[PDB]
Design a protein around this ligand. Structure first.
Ligand SMILES: Nc1ncnc2c1ncn2[C@@H]1O[C@H](COP(=O)(O)OP(=O)(O)OP(=O)(O)O)[C@@H](O)[C@H]1O
Ligand SMILES: [Mg+2]
Ligand SMILES: [Mg+2]
Lengths: 147, 985
């Protein structure tokens, strides 16, 4: 529990993610507030997105609860911030680190997956009218992810 | 007419058909000693038609060594007569009778015949008649630490289910013309060669959809073969395969034929040469008893052992057994011939009861045929076992003194145990402890803790509780029952009603845990197990863990400084479905049930919590606006449940239920089909609605349909309960109100500054002030599965079935919905008895203080296939710290309440290690990367003061120690694990 959490924290500290920065809330090790930088080759460029990570008491035997806080216009992210990632619901194994999760989320932001979406309307817009999706994503990442 | 309010947990293991066939079968039990009474109790709890007893011998004192329905006032009375009265109160649907004399023809009145404590000639006589008349015959024998079971269900037994598992089903990606069936990506069917499967919904190959089972040839973890499908088609796409389970024919042999050439069942593969020895030994025991007027060899007597060995030689020569007899093992059997242990009796009783259930229900794979078991590793070695010490003293513990001796009896009588929980396993453990005489001495004591209350469904497997005890605490009732069983335990048992957790450390503190001898868990959740394991590791007390699941069971023993703890082992956790699967594209009924549960929580629980919290917290809105993930949702819920849609009668509740039906089963589907039409294609050109994704279809509300009406009734009743209105169930009012409902129009929408805060403020100020509404509270609906008059499972079933009808999924009844939604763990009485027996066999090992690790045995068993296995515990890992051998689990650092700087200096000078992280509880006390100001502010403080400051809570007076987790780096910076720190306040 605490030992694994601090090992991951030290690995993050010693190895700079350079696109993410995860730190505990106050002095609680079971609650982190991570940060993600918008990918360069994506509509979310130049944006800072905040994530809340709640480690379950049975960590690492149960997946952490990762939820977006900054509103983002993505097909696989709903209004509650829930993220559609296989490694967080049922494919979780006690061998995945937080840096891996952040890399997975960054890759998801790089290219969405509309074939198995979580927000049907955004997926439909992405599939049919790409330009409107690009404009909406830029507007949202300018309104929320900046400032 | 199965009483589902009593057999709720058992029906998830057996089923409705099995119990229907079981409630028409009679069982006769010959012999009413401890093993016989255990079998009778398990069978009565199981629910057979009736039980008959036959044991006319007068009661003796030593018989009380394993009989819990006999008292010292019953000496001289036949056992059956004094046992039937107490057996009749276990179950009200199972009459229990007594027969004075047994005649051969009378055996035709019964479906199963169990024989215990009978000579071999009489067993042969009974079997010669119960074999040719097709009657199940089960013979059990318990001699000291040895046990034998023999089963004979006729020459044409039919086994419908051979493993008890659910049929394997899966999805298909593609089917070739050569019969090669391929699963989807990363999908393993789990079939075996020889299985039969059937295909449905196969596109391109309609012939495979007929339903005729076909053979399976396993070619890999992801593909298999069925043969040749040339005629039916060329290539098939998509579909679902389902395994078909076919009946099997099992042929047994009579006892007379099987004595010469038996067929053993091996309970352990480390000792495979023993069962042939036991086969001769038990026959020689019967012959010796016949040669001494039914007198078994005296305990630890050399002359009787020699005579028994001569009989063994004679029998081995007679039967032409080409096996060399092991003198030591045979003489050990001779020494313990008069033993009567309650643990072995419970183990064999559970096994034999399961065999009886198999015989009556024609289910599960039975023993075929002999089963010889021994737990000789439990024999004490730290006490003097001889003829003088093992002689009877004319007390009720003679059956145990004859195996362990008087000194070990005194050792047991001074135990100070701690039992966590009072469930089925707890009740069995308490019974075993009462029979064994645990804590009947001057220094003994027993503690039992459990906060739950007795319910109706708990009486099926918890024999210490009676229907008159429904609604009371478990611990008090269990303590009273076991004090009645053994009068010597009056005042030696303390029953608490406290939940064992972080909040109970004020009672179960250092003083309480420093006087115990061992801790036994009877829990059903992993969190409490882990907490108790951590406490035992800290205090260094032996721990006994036991778990059951349906017919499977396991027992584990944790020994200080010898074996690893419970938390070092991991079990497969539950599988939680992806959110995208539950929300939009379900393909199984479990997805719909989970969606229905989430809908129930979101409709009847969370909004009520928000409304109640709004009227209590004076600053709720401001906190929610900057804390809650969706302030808009909370504001909308509060408005809707306070002013917009507050009902004034039940008719408005019915209208709201109809509106919610329309919202969740007719409109969202239209929106989804507008976003993803049925003819839409993916990026690769394949159709979108194919495979795991099923095309939905909106539902039109038809009042005459049963499911729609059920959903309306359940939703209206729950809404009325939330608003404290008077609900009604007459269909007339529902049909009258729902006729006059005008559906609002709905058309799917295609879409196409900082005023959001202004809109949220406008919503917020619309709410009435909290001062205006004083004393107005809404009742949240707390989910309770066991109550059938609150419409919870009814609503969940209705919603799940409606969503299944949306996606053309097979609907499920209320039984399976209650099983899935309620997280009900299947349980059985036989499995509980077996695990209790195994744990009590490990307890005598723990009491004797055995040091080697090969003398302990973690046990696993599966009663569906008659599988038993025992393995050595995993040794606690060692490590090298500062060039010294450190135990990873059972070692710690003992330090005073020194300052943080002094602790760092101590670790730097003694261990030569640099501290990098120090935590306690859920707080990070010290880290190497914190700003220097914070450390300089925290360094000169003591550990207790530092914890008080960080956790913002004073240390309680009862607290006397702190557990600190420290991660430190060596001189070169390489991370090295170190044991935790035990700071002494
Ligand atoms: N943390 C705990 N501290 C103390 N007792 C506990 C704790 N957790 C569970 N128990 C008790 O352990 C016992 C477990 O027994 P069991 O699971 O068979 O009963 P149940 O949960 O009441 O029944 P069912 O599972 O059939 O609905 C229950 O008495 C439960 O109250
Ligand atoms: Mg209960
Ligand atoms: Mg339970």
């Amino acid at each position: 529990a605490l030992k694994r959490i601090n090992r991951e924290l030290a690995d993050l500290g010693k190895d700079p993610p350079s696109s993410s920065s995860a730190g505990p809330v106050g002095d609680d090790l079971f609650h982190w507030q991570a940060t993600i930088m918008g990918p360069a080759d994506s509509p979310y460029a130049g944006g800072v997105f905040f994530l809340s990570i709640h480690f379950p008491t049975d960590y690492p035997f149960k997946p952490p609860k990762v939820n977006f806080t900054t509103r983002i216009y993505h097909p696989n992210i709903n209004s509650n911030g829930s993220i559609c990632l296989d490694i967080l619901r049922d494919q979780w194994s006690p061998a995945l680190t937080i840096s891996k999760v952040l890399l997975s989320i960054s890759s998801l932001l790089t290219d969405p997956n509309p074939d198995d979406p979580l927000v049907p309307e955004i997926a439909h817009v992405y599939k049919t009218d790409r330009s409107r999706y690009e404009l909406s994503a830029r507007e949202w990442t300018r309104k929320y992810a900046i400032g | 007419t199965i009483d589902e309010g009593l057999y709720s947990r058992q029906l998830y293991v057996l089923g409705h058909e099995a119990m229907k066939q079981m409630s028409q079968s009679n069982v006769l039990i010959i012999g009413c000693k401890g093993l016989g009474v255990e079998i009778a109790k398990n069978v009565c709890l199981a629910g057979v038609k009736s039980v008959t007893l036959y044991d006319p011998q007068p009661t003796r004192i030593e018989d009380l060594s394993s009989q819990y329905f006999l008292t010292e006032d019953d000496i001289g009375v036949p056992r059956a007569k004094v046992t039937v009265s107490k057996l009749a109160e276990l179950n009200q649907y199972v009459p229990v009778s007594v027969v004075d004399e047994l005649s051969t023809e009378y055996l035709k009145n019964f479906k199963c015949v169990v024989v215990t404590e009978t000579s071999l000639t009489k067993q042969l006589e009974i079997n010669d008649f119960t074999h040719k008349n097709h009657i199940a015959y089960i013979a059990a024998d318990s001699r000291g630490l040895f046990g034998s079971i023999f089963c004979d269900f006729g020459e044409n037994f039919i086994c419908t289910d051979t493993d008890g598992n659910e049929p394997l089903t899966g999805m298909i990606a593609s089917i070739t013309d050569d019969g090669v069936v391929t699963m989807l990506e990363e999908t393993r069917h789990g079939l075996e060669n020889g299985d039969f499967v059937k295909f449905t919904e196969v596109k391109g190959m309609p012939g495979l959809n007929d339903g005729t089972p076909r053979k399976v040839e396993v070619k890999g973890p992801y593909t298999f073969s069925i043969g040749s499908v040339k005629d039916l088609g060329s290539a098939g796409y998509n579909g679902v395969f389902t395994q078909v389970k076919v009946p099997t024919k099992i042929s047994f042999k009579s006892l007379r034929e099987s004595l010469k050439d038996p067929e053993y069942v091996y309970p352990d593969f480390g000792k495979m040469m023993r069962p042939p020895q036991y086969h001769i030994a038990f026959q020689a025991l019967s012959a010796f008893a016949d040669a001494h007027e039914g007198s078994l060899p005296r305990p630890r007597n050399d002359i009787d052992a020699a005579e028994f060995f001569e009989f063994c030689k004679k029998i081995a020569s007679t039967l032409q057994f080409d096996v060399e007899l092991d003198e030591k093992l045979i003489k050990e059997i001779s020494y313990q011939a008069r033993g009567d242990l309650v643990a072995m009796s419970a183990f064999l009783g559970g096994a034999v009861a399961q065999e009886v259930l198999k015989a009556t229900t024609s289910k599960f794979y039975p023993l075929k045929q002999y089963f010889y078991f021994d737990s000789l590793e439990s024999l004490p070695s730290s006490v003097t076992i001889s003829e003088e010490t093992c002689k009877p003293r004319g007390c009720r513990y003679d059956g145990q003194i004859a195996v362990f001796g008087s000194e070990f009896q005194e050792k047991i009588a001074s135990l100070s145990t701690f039992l966590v929980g009072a469930g089925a396993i707890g009740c069995e453990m308490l019974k075993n402890w009462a029979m064994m005489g645990v804590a009947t001495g001057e220094s003994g004591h027993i503690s039992v803790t459990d906060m739950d209350s007795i319910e109706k469904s708990n009486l099926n497997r918890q024999f210490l509780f009676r229907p008159r005890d429904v609604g009371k605490l478990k611990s008090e009732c269990a303590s009273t029952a076991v004090s009645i069983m053994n009068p010597s335990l009056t005042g030696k048992i303390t029953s608490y009603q406290e939940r064992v957790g972080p909040e109970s450390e004020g009672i179960f503190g250092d003083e309480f845990f420093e006087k115990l001898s061992l801790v036994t868990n009877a829990l059903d959740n992993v969190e409490a197990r882990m907490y108790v394991d951590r406490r035992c590791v800290f205090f260094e007390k032996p721990l006994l863990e036991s778990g059951t699941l349906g017919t499977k069971g396991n027992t584990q023993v944790v020994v200080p400084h010898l074996t690893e703890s419970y938390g070092s082992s991991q079990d497969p956790p539950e599988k939680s479905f992806p959110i995208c699967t539950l929300k939009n594209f379900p393909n199984r009924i479990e997805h719909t049930i989970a969606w229905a549960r989430d809908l129930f929580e979101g409709l009847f629980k969370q909004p009520i919590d928000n409304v109640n919290m709004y009227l209590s917290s004076p600053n709720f809105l401001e906190t929610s606006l900057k804390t809650s993930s969706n302030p808009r949702e909370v504001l909308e819920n509060i408005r809707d449940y306070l002013v917009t849609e507050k009902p004034l009668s039940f008719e408005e509740c019915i209208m709201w239920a109809r509106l919610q039906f329309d919202k969740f089963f007719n409109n969202n589907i239209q929106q989804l089909l507008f976003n993803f039409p049925k003819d839409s294609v993916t990026s690769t050109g394949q159709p979108f609605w194919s495979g795991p994704k099923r095309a939905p279809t909106p539902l039109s509300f038809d009042i005459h349909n049963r499911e729609h009406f059920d959903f309306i009734v359940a939703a209206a009743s729950l809404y009325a309960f939330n608003y404290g209105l008077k609900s009604e169930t007459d269909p007339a009012i529902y049909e009258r109100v729902l006729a006059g409902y005008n559906p609002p129009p709905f058309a799917p929408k295609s879409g196409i500054a900082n005023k959001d805060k202004q809109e949220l403020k406008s919503i917020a100020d619309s709410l009435p002030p909290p001062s205006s509404l004083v004393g107005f509270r809404l009742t949240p609906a707390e989910f309770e599965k066991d109550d059938d008059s609150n419409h919870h499972i009814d609503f969940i079933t209705a919603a799940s079935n409606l969503r299944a009808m949306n996606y053309d999924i097979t609907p499920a009844d209320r039984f399976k919905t209650k099983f899935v939604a309620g997280k009900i763990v299947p349980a059985m009485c036989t499995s509980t008895a077996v695990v209790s027996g195994l744990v009590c066999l490990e307890l005598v090992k723990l009491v004797d203080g055995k040091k080697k690790i090969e003398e302990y045995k973690n046990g696993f068993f599966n009663l569906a296939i008659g599988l038993f296995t025992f393995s050595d515990p995993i040794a606690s890992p060692k490590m090298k710290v500062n060039g010294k051998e450190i135990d990873k689990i059972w070692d710690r650092y003992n330090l005073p309440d020194c300052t943080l700087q002094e602790l760092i200096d101590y670790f730097q000078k003694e261990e030569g290690l640099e501290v990098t992280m120090l935590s306690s509880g859920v707080s990070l006390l010290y880290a190497n990367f914190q700003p220097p100001k914070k450390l300089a502010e925290r360094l000169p403080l003591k550990i207790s003061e530092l914890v008080e400051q960080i956790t913002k809570k004073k240390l309680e007076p009862f607290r006397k120690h702190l557990v600190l987790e420290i991660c430190c780096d060596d001189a070169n910076g390489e991370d090295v694990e170190v044991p935790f720190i035990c700071i002494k306040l």
